[PDB]
Enzyme design. Structure first.
Site, short mmCIF file in Angstrom:
data_model
loop_
_atom_site.label_atom_id
_atom_site.label_comp_id
_atom_site.label_asym_id
_atom_site.label_seq_id
_atom_site.Cartn_x
_atom_site.Cartn_y
_atom_site.Cartn_z
N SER A 43 4.03 2.63 8.51
CA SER A 43 3.63 1.58 7.55
C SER A 43 4.81 1.08 6.72
CB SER A 43 2.54 2.10 6.60
OG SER A 43 1.36 2.46 7.31
N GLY A 44 4.90 -0.25 6.57
CA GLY A 44 5.98 -0.88 5.80
C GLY A 44 7.19 -1.23 6.65
N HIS A 68 0.81 -1.23 0.00
CA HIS A 68 0.00 0.00 0.00
C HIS A 68 0.85 1.29 0.00
CE1 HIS A 68 0.02 0.54 4.54
NE2 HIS A 68 -0.04 1.81 4.15
N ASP A 84 -0.82 -7.26 1.85
CA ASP A 84 -0.11 -5.97 1.90
C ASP A 84 1.40 -6.19 2.08
OD1 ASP A 84 0.31 -3.24 1.84
OD2 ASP A 84 -0.40 -2.88 3.89
C1 LIG Z 1 -4.24 8.56 4.91
C2 LIG Z 1 -3.83 7.17 5.35
C3 LIG Z 1 -4.41 6.87 6.70
O1 LIG Z 1 -5.00 7.70 7.38
C4 LIG Z 1 -4.20 5.46 7.20
N1 LIG Z 1 -4.40 5.25 8.66
C5 LIG Z 1 -5.61 4.49 9.06
C6 LIG Z 1 -6.96 5.17 8.90
C7 LIG Z 1 -7.92 4.15 8.31
N2 LIG Z 1 -7.07 2.97 8.04
C8 LIG Z 1 -7.63 1.66 7.80
C9 LIG Z 1 -8.91 1.45 8.60
C10 LIG Z 1 -7.94 1.61 6.32
O2 LIG Z 1 -8.07 2.64 5.68
N3 LIG Z 1 -8.07 0.39 5.73
C11 LIG Z 1 -8.89 0.29 4.51
C12 LIG Z 1 -8.49 -0.93 3.72
O3 LIG Z 1 -8.63 -2.07 4.56
C13 LIG Z 1 -7.67 -2.03 5.60
C14 LIG Z 1 -7.99 -0.86 6.50
C15 LIG Z 1 -5.76 3.14 8.41
O4 LIG Z 1 -4.84 2.35 8.27
S1 LIG Z 1 -3.31 5.65 9.81
O5 LIG Z 1 -2.34 6.52 9.16
O6 LIG Z 1 -4.03 6.10 10.98
C16 LIG Z 1 -2.43 4.18 10.29
C17 LIG Z 1 -1.61 3.55 9.38
C18 LIG Z 1 -0.94 2.40 9.76
C19 LIG Z 1 -1.08 1.88 11.04
C20 LIG Z 1 -0.41 0.72 11.40
C21 LIG Z 1 -0.56 0.22 12.68
CL1 LIG Z 1 0.26 -1.24 13.17
C22 LIG Z 1 -1.38 0.86 13.59
C23 LIG Z 1 -2.05 2.01 13.22
C24 LIG Z 1 -1.90 2.52 11.94
C25 LIG Z 1 -2.58 3.68 11.57
#
Ligand SMILES: CCC(=O)CN([C@H]1C=CN([C@@H](C)C(=O)N2CCOCC2)C1=O)S(=O)(=O)c1ccc2cc(Cl)ccc2c1
Ligand SMILES: [Ca+2]
Lengths: 52, 234
Positions: free
Chosen positions: B185-186, B42, B88
């Site tokens: 991430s990654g 991703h 991923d």
């Molecule tokens: C703009 C990118 C972003 O905000 C990503 N972050 C999270 C907000 C929603 N999601 C998940 C729910 C998501 O979008 N997915 C859709 C596809 O199916 C899988 C889930 C996010 O990941 S984030 O930046 O808050 C983020 C990113 C990575 C993380 C990794 C860990 Cl281990 C824990 C928290 C994280 C939060």
């Protein structure tokens, strides 16, 4: 028993084959004469924190 | 990384950072060998052109071990889907080989059966990165690490609003304010066994960062060991 008892006395990977424990190591290591310890083949082997 | 601590000299040498045209980090990676980096599929939709930096602990000062590498080949899993973030995982082959030294070394790839029975049953693993220190905050100038407990699979599924596939596992805390975050991430999730560190996960996703009743979701590396082996020979 075997791998369930202190990793079979192996430094790294443990496998149960027939009735006994068989140890092995990650790429970049070789198994010692005792068949349990793992010896790095060169500088900066995988998985070790660096001191120098 | 929300909560946690700084990586001290030589303690997180497998950390890699994916940097954009502006020299800003946007994702993490794990050093696997002199030519290969492990990362999240991703992360590949976050920059047109990017490079990889290793041997860095402080983005504000020259320490002496920093090295930038250009990417030759990008190998993304063909079953990756943006809908659920299933599969991923990606591997990057570099144009020039990484010269190992203080703060620059690879993490070990484990065997599947042993890693699932022995590593993934330990109490904790370790996540690291230069990501946001708060859900809505800024990225860290210091490389951070955090000890994260392995979380019971049934408990994680019950707490999640999104599907948890066979290719994912959960780690972190229910209420304690510690977790990975945006920009991490990654990056690496590693498990220690007799002073040797093995890669066990890839920072993937979460419903926000460190929220109550929610956990960090990681790509299950042990399910992709044959895949990684194929990608590193091509
Ligand atoms: C703009 C990118 C972003 O905000 C990503 N972050 C999270 C907000 C929603 N999601 C998940 C729910 C998501 O979008 N997915 C859709 C596809 O199916 C899988 C889930 C996010 O990941 S984030 O930046 O808050 C983020 C990113 C990575 C993380 C990794 C860990 Cl281990 C824990 C928290 C994280 C939060
Ligand atoms: Ca620096």
């Amino acid at each position: 028993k075997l791998c369930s008892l202190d990793n079979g006395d192996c430094d790294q990977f443990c496998h149960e084959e027939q009735n006994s424990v068989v140890c092995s190591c990650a790429r970049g290591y070789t198994l010692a004469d005792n068949g349990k310890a793992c010896i790095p083949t060169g500088p900066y082997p995988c998985g070790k924190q660096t001191l120098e | 990384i929300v909560g946690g601590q700084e990586c001290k000299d030589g303690e997180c040498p497998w950390q890699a950072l994916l940097i954009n045209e502006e020299n800003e980090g946007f994702c993490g990676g794990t050093i696997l060998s002199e030519f290969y980096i492990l990362t999240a599929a991703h992360c590949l939709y976050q920059a047109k052109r990017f490079k990889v930096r290793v041997g860095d602990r402080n983005t504000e000062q020259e320490e002496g071990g920093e090295a930038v590498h250009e990417v030759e080949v990008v190998i993304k899993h063909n079953r990756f889907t943006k809908e659920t973030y299933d599969f991923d995982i990606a591997v990057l082959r570099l144009k020039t080989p990484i010269t190992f030294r203080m703060n620059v070394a690879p993490a070990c790839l484990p065997e599947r059966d042993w890693a699932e029975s022995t590593l993934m049953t330990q109490k904790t693993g370790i996540v690291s990165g230069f990501g946001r220190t708060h859900e809505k905050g800024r990225q860290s100038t210091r490389l951070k690490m955090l000890e994260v407990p392995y979380v019971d699979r049934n408990s994680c599924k019950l707490s999640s609003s999104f599907i948890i596939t066979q290719n994912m596992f959960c780690a972190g805390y229910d209420t304690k304010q510690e977790d990975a975050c945006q920009g991490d991430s990654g990056g690496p999730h590693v498990t220690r066994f007799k002073d040797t560190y093995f890669v066990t996960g890839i920072v993937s996703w979460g419903e926000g960062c460190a929220r109550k009743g929610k956990y960090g979701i990681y790509t299950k590396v042990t399910a992709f060991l044959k895949w990684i082996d194929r990608s590193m020979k091509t």
